[PDB]
Design a protein around this ligand. Sequence first.
Ligand code: HEC
Ligand code: NA
Length: 108
Amino acid sequence: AEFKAGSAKKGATLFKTRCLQCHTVEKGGPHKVGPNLHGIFGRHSGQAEGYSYTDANIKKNVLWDENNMSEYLTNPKKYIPGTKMAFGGLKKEKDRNDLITYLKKATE
Ligand code: HEC
Ligand code: NA
């Protein structure tokens, strides 16, 4: 994937309607179904403390960045076979861009 900066505000609404049910983003926000995502960019997958990950997510051992995030969110289970993240994917490129733009800022 090739991330391009988009709308953080549209990204916030996307995140809040599609991800918030399972994830928080703020520093010190709780793990829910999925892990809190603060600091996710520039951290390896499966390394948020206090969250019980699948072996598949840990073994993937991907250094999260803007580009591999876009790929992941397109089809999570395709990028990380075995993941328990039950999200079909964001198929529109503009949506992933908007979401990732938000995500970069919100996870600081
Ligand atoms: C539950 C119904 C979820 C929804 C909706 C979304 N996510 Fe998720 N995500 C969920 C789980 C259970 C997990 C852990 C998967 C595992 O196999 O252990 C995840 C994982 C992620 C990750 C990776 C986190 C890491 O520390 O490596 C990211 C980056 C992530 N999820 C982001 C994300 C976004 C942006 C969502 C909506 C667009 C989203 N998730 C939805 C559970 C669920
Ligand atoms: Na709860």
